[PDB]
Amino acid sequence: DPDKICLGHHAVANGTIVKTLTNEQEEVTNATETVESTSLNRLCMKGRNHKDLGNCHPIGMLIGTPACDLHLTGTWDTLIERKNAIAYCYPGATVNEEALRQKIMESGGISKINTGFTYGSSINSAGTTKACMRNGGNSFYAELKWLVSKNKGQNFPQTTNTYRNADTAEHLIMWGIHHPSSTQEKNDLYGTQSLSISVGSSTYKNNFVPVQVNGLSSRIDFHWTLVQPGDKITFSHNGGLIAPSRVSKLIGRGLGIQSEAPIDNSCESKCFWRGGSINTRLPFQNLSPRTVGQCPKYVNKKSLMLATGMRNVPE
Amino acid sequence: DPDKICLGHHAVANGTIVKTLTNEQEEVTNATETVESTSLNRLCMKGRNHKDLGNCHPIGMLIGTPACDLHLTGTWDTLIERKNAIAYCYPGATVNEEALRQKIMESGGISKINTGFTYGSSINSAGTTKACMRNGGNSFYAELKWLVSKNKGQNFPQTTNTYRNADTAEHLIMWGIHHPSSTQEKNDLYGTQSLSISVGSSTYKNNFVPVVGARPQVNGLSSRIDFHWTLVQPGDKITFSHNGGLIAPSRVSKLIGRGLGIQSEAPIDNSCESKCFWRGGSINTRLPFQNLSPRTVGQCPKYVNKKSLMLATGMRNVPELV
Amino acid sequence: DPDKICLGHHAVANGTIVKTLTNEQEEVTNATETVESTSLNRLCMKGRNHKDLGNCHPIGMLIGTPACDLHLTGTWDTLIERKNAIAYCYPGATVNEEALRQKIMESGGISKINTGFTYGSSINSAGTTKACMRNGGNSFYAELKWLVSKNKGQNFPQTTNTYRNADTAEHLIMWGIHHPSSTQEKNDLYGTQSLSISVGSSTYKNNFVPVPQVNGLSSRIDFHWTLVQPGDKITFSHNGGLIAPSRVSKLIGRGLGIQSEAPIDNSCESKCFWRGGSINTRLPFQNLSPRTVGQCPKYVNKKSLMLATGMRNVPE
Amino acid sequence: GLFGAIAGFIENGWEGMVDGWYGFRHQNAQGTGQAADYKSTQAAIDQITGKLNRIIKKTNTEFESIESEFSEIDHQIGNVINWTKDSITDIWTYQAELLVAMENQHTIDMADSEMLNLYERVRKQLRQNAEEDGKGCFEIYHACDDSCMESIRNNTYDHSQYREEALLNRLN
Amino acid sequence: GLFGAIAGFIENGWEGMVDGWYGFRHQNAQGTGQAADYKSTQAAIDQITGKLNRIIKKTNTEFESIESEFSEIDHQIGNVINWTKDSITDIWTYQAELLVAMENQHTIDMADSEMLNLYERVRKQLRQNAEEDGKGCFEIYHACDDSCMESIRNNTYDHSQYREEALLNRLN
Amino acid sequence: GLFGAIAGFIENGWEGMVDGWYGFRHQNAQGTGQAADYKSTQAAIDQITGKLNRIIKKTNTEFESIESEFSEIDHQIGNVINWTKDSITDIWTYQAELLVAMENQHTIDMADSEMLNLYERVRKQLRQNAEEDGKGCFEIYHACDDSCMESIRNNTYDHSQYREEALLNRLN
Ligand SMILES: *[C@@H]1O[C@H](CO)[C@@H](O[C@@H]2O[C@H](CO)[C@@H](O)[C@H](O)[C@H]2NC(C)=O)[C@H](O)[C@H]1NC(C)=O
Ligand SMILES: *[C@@H]1O[C@H](CO)[C@@H](O[C@@H]2O[C@H](CO)[C@@H](O)[C@H](O)[C@H]2NC(C)=O)[C@H](O)[C@H]1NC(C)=O
Ligand SMILES: *[C@@H]1O[C@H](CO)[C@@H](O)[C@H](O)[C@H]1NC(C)=O
Ligand SMILES: *[C@@H]1O[C@H](CO)[C@@H](O)[C@H](O)[C@H]1NC(C)=O
Ligand SMILES: *[C@@H]1O[C@H](CO)[C@@H](O)[C@H](O)[C@H]1NC(C)=O
Numbered sequence A: 001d002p003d004k005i006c007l008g009h010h011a012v013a014n015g016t017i018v019k020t021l022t023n024e025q026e027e028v029t030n031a032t033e034t035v036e037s038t039s040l041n042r043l044c045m046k047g048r049n050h051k052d053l054g055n056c057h058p059i060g061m062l063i064g065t066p067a068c069d070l071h072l073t074g075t076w077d078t079l080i081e082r083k084n085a086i087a088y089c090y091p092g093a094t095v096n097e098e099a100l101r102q103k104i105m106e107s108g109g110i111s112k113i114n115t116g117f118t119y120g121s122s123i124n125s126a127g128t129t130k131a132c133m134r135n136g137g138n139s140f141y142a143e144l145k146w147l148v149s150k151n152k153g154q155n156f157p158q159t160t161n162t163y164r165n166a167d168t169a170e171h172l173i174m175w176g177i178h179h180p181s182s183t184q185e186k187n188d189l190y191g192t193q194s195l196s197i198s199v200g201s202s203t204y205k206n207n208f209v210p211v212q213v214n215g216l217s218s219r220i221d222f223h224w225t226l227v228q229p230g231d232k233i234t235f236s237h238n239g240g241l242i243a244p245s246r247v248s249k250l251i252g253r254g255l256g257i258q259s260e261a262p263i264d265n266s267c268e269s270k271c272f273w274r275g276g277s278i279n280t281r282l283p284f285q286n287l288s289p290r291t292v293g294q295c296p297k298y299v300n301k302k303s304l305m306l307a308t309g310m311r312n313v314p315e
Numbered sequence B: 001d002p003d004k005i006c007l008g009h010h011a012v013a014n015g016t017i018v019k020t021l022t023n024e025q026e027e028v029t030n031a032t033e034t035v036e037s038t039s040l041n042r043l044c045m046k047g048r049n050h051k052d053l054g055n056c057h058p059i060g061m062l063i064g065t066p067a068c069d070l071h072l073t074g075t076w077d078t079l080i081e082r083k084n085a086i087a088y089c090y091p092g093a094t095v096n097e098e099a100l101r102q103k104i105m106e107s108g109g110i111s112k113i114n115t116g117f118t119y120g121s122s123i124n125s126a127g128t129t130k131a132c133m134r135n136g137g138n139s140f141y142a143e144l145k146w147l148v149s150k151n152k153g154q155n156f157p158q159t160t161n162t163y164r165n166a167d168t169a170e171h172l173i174m175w176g177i178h179h180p181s182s183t184q185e186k187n188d189l190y191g192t193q194s195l196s197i198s199v200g201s202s203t204y205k206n207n208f209v210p211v212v213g214a215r216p217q218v219n220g221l222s223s224r225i226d227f228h229w230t231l232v233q234p235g236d237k238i239t240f241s242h243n244g245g246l247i248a249p250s251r252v253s254k255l256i257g258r259g260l261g262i263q264s265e266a267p268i269d270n271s272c273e274s275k276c277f278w279r280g281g282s283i284n285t286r287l288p289f290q291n292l293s294p295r296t297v298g299q300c301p302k303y304v305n306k307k308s309l310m311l312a313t314g315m316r317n318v319p320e321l322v
Numbered sequence C: 001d002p003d004k005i006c007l008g009h010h011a012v013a014n015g016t017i018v019k020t021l022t023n024e025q026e027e028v029t030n031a032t033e034t035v036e037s038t039s040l041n042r043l044c045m046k047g048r049n050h051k052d053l054g055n056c057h058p059i060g061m062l063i064g065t066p067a068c069d070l071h072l073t074g075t076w077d078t079l080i081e082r083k084n085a086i087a088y089c090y091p092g093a094t095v096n097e098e099a100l101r102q103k104i105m106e107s108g109g110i111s112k113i114n115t116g117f118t119y120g121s122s123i124n125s126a127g128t129t130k131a132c133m134r135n136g137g138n139s140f141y142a143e144l145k146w147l148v149s150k151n152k153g154q155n156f157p158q159t160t161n162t163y164r165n166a167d168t169a170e171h172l173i174m175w176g177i178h179h180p181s182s183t184q185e186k187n188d189l190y191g192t193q194s195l196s197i198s199v200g201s202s203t204y205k206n207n208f209v210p211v212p213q214v215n216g217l218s219s220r221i222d223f224h225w226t227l228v229q230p231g232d233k234i235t236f237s238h239n240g241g242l243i244a245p246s247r248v249s250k251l252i253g254r255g256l257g258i259q260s261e262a263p264i265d266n267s268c269e270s271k272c273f274w275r276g277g278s279i280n281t282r283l284p285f286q287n288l289s290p291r292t293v294g295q296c297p298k299y300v301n302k303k304s305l306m307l308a309t310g311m312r313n314v315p316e
Numbered sequence D, E, F: 001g002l003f004g005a006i007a008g009f010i011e012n013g014w015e016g017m018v019d020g021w022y023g024f025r026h027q028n029a030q031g032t033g034q035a036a037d038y039k040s041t042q043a044a045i046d047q048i049t050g051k052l053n054r055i056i057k058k059t060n061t062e063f064e065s066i067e068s069e070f071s072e073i074d075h076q077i078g079n080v081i082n083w084t085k086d087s088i089t090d091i092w093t094y095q096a097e098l099l100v101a102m103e104n105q106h107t108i109d110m111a112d113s114e115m116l117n118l119y120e121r122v123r124k125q126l127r128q129n130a131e132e133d134g135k136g137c138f139e140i141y142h143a144c145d146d147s148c149m150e151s152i153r154n155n156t157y158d159h160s161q162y163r164e165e166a167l168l169n170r171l172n
């Protein structure tokens, strides 16, 4: 009999379930995801001055292993280390290895500076090995010199070499200490004498005494220190020292990515992990708790759906 | 024609913008700030028994560098370290350096206790240097003795000194190990013999060998004195076996109570009060957040990456349109 | 004149006070607690394969102090260390002591493996002491051998022993180095000669040199340890003064390490523990201790926080 | 309150009502009666249950020790742990205080809403046959027997049936 | 719901309405008609947009590695990192679960509020010329042509014009 | 907003009203008058005070240094601290942004609620003797002198006294 006007709201056939403070199964017209589950299998290096090290291990850059020849110097904002990267062409390790790697991967480039170190004619500087191949012929670490007596068996002359840091910023000096297995090898190369190697600056001081991998029990182990601006560092040795021909300077800061995934200069990103890039605009992710850069926060959630619409009541 | 009563709410000409869950630009009658941006450039030490160390580095208090002569002892609830403070008059470092500094800066004072250590007449106790000046004449760390042979060149007598902690609370014993530059210097002072220094208690044990090597010169001296430390428990003893090269404790240190450790270049003010401090001074704000520095000490507002966060203290402002 | 129907809501005589965004003293019909204040003074080890060490210090398991005899071997998912537990029957310490303890307390068991070490007839293997008592008679660390010359005074023969790791997982080898105080004592067991002890594998290598009275003894036995990789060997060169491994240790899987003075109870279950015992509360917070282990309510600086489970209470 | 029902125009609650949270008291010729509304009571209780299911829980995360109860650890790493742990405890204390406070505010206002929602259902049902006294009662301007009351409560009251009688009584 | 409009006195929504969130259905002499209310639809959508702009973002903070993917790190510092990282993940998981849950509750109730707010605008506009059926409809007690309907929706309906006709029809 | 009083059916606020937050403007024979409602104003202010008491404070927790201002610290422990501290700052920045945003939303809606709650108190008081104009005013259908107005504001207005006069004026 009477005219009538009704107020109402829309609905949809297919609604989505979300969670509220009171209801675990609340159907609404529209929701959206807040946790990212998908990852790009590539490293998005667009608009980044990057350096993919490939088979070069960051420490190899400072001592100059063959593999790292293309990476002895440069400038970057991003540094990408790879799996099973090579630091040591001749068997050995660096003391405080991990601390050094982390320091290089925070760097935004590397300058090299000549020590200027010269040696008496009774010394052989360019001592090489079949382990470190370069131009398909026996070679050695580019930034170090293998110091051995020129006459096989002759006792090694007492030498003193000293680097001073002329620069206004700290310099990273590395050096090696050869320890052969057999007394026949040591006498042949350095002489019968007791060997002692003393290194000293204002900051640092240390003494070293030379004591089967690739068929060799003989090692070259590496040590490192920072040498302050204006300060000097002196090396006293009677043989067995692998001497720095160059010191390293780490410049500015850079993002260090450890990833097996391939480069792509077409795509951009500020967040990376082992398995690649994360360009999601979402505020959370559940891919990995180990990420680097500006990133969504890791959460222990497959999905968290955010209602973008009213309750859905069909019929 | 008809009588009428209207309900309404106040408004203001100048409203403030705040942020809600839905609106980034919401005008309300009144808001207030929640993040503190203002800082006092002074250290507010009212109602605090404080000790400004000045040129003295906290470690220097325990070994007794000249600079720290006024600060070998005392009681406090607040300890203020300064920039370029001096710990080492004679070149060297302390092993576990930072760990010790932090321990001293948590302390609420320092007692000193005599080791009572005595040495054979073939030993020289009062060995001094031009590096550590006191009364404008060659001296040494007040709390340690430089042990050297009395006859230049003579081998250093095997000695054994032992401190026992008679006290009811733990004691902090420090000692040094001299490493000279040249072998001419070591033989001259300790003798040709191989040197070995063993220190041992119930808790702790360690062996030390003076290292001889060419190194550069600090205050015209290439030789170093490096320091080591440990806690000696109540009732326990610690023994030093040495054939020369040990810098021996004449006194042990005892850290008393707890205290707030401030690292700040900023000056004191005993007129003003505060429970929160940072490099750049004090923070007295009653607000729950601040954006001055993430490095603060005491009871503090939480650091946030926000210039301002305005909290509505009034209703939506809808003004009379014109 | 007219009939009436009234709408209303329940109330109660005794309401609870809770806190809201606006009101610190809001009375409601019913609330519930969110912070747990009560703690069980026992360790609830039901449905867990546990090992209470008692007087045994975890390191003592690897060298085999008398006290640890019942715990030289086994499998577990939970390991309970106690206060003032004994590691060293003979005076000494282990270098990197705490690092080793933490490693053992993460473990889910210990296998023992024989080194197979053999010695010349000029050597005495079964050297014992009054400090380490076992079966009411002088004894020694079960997993090590005290190597001394058989003829009193005689200089100790240069010996070389080598362990190889036949297993597919890393093995934990420890050994000791005897330092006597007085040269008169050392002469009886080892000779006048300079003593030097070198141990070496692929992974690392080192040599150490023998140098106040504890349990009536001034002589010390200090211990060292390292991991020996699968397939690799470790060789021990000594001219006397080495305490030699008769067995190497192998850590199995992972396990929860509890440090607690509180007693066991196999009747009750829990996933959260602290010094003072177990925490089985279903609540999301607790204020008992910030040092807890397992799956736990989060520590909060709050005695109580009451969650309203009912409307405002407005009484008659 | 946000909705002005509970601790509002309704002067107080009923200790007498022990079969529900929200309900009715009527007054007719026959005498007086009281009854609970189930649907509105269950609505409130279900929402509070929901909160309890979400709030009364801990994480599945297994945490190991990083502090030895029975031995000293390096002083520097110890201070880092102390700082981190205290920083976390500050967060969780805050997150807890906020959660409970915010939920409490909502629990209250939610219950207020459910009362007002019942009143408004009744108001609309009675249409032009009753008037609000402003204390949460409807003065019904006709003979409403106990069957008529049960009809209001069970949402079966047809206003049209009593409309004529009611409009006369009202205009007088 | 807090406001009892959506999933309340309004029995269900309209799958048929695809030009807006809130709107009208009328029935007069001329026939039936449906139309969306723009202002009320936009109000709800703008508020939800607002939430999305705030919630869909990450921080500016650049985080470096403290865990090597390809090499072992000291066991003790590693356990500290593991503990810290797990503790942070617990917080962010909680903070995320709470945020979304709390926003969801609000988004819903906000939309409810916007429906009720439209109904109340219409109710007050029609004044004494219509009555609530309690299903979200107004029974209009006069001839309301399509121009009269468009006048209700466009907030131009002058109650005074139909008042006398309506009050007679109502009292009968 | 949620309650549609403020920035809703009430077109704007009154810069003129400086003795309260909520109040009345009347128009009768005698002339015009304005007055604040104390109880409703104090209700809103007390709730905002409450928020300020809870929000404006720091923790009791004493934090020590773990970063030396005047000396370099080990590179590895330093990176851990940097990561942890940045992670904490991200949390507290988020917790702060959410707190203030959520409180702001509530503060606003709370004040809206308190306006609507006063209107509804008056509406129910005037009963059948006035009608809503939809702008937050009641057209009173009888002679309401300044004593009659003061009676509306002071919640002492007896509808029955003017009912007869009012119902006649309304039906005409
Ligand atoms: C880390 O914090 C804890 C608890 O606040 C400290 O534990 C205290 O340690 C001292 C020993 O010097 C005792 O006197 C107290 O009784 C201890 N309290 C508890 C509850 O154990 C701990 O020392 C702090 N660590 C550092 C490095 O400062
Ligand atoms: C920190 O946690 C990581 C990940 O939970 C640990 O690495 C895992 O260790 C398990 C159990 O022993 C291995 O089976 C997995 O293969 C490892 N997973 C990954 C992804 O690395 C790591 O052991 C912990 N760090 C320390 C120092 O214990
Ligand atoms: C929900 O919103 C998103 C984002 O605007 C849109 O892509 C999607 O089509 C919407 N879904 C529905 C069913 O309207
Ligand atoms: C940690 O951050 C501070 C502040 O930017 C910086 O100065 C310092 O070098 C950082 N430490 C390390 C080890 O990167
Ligand atoms: C309330 O206001 C009216 C205004 O006329 C006044 O007459 C009455 O006495 C007041 N009541 C009280 C208790 O103040």
Ligand SMILES: [Ca+2]
Residues within 6 Å of the ligand: B106, D079, D082, F064
């Ligand atoms: Ca501390």
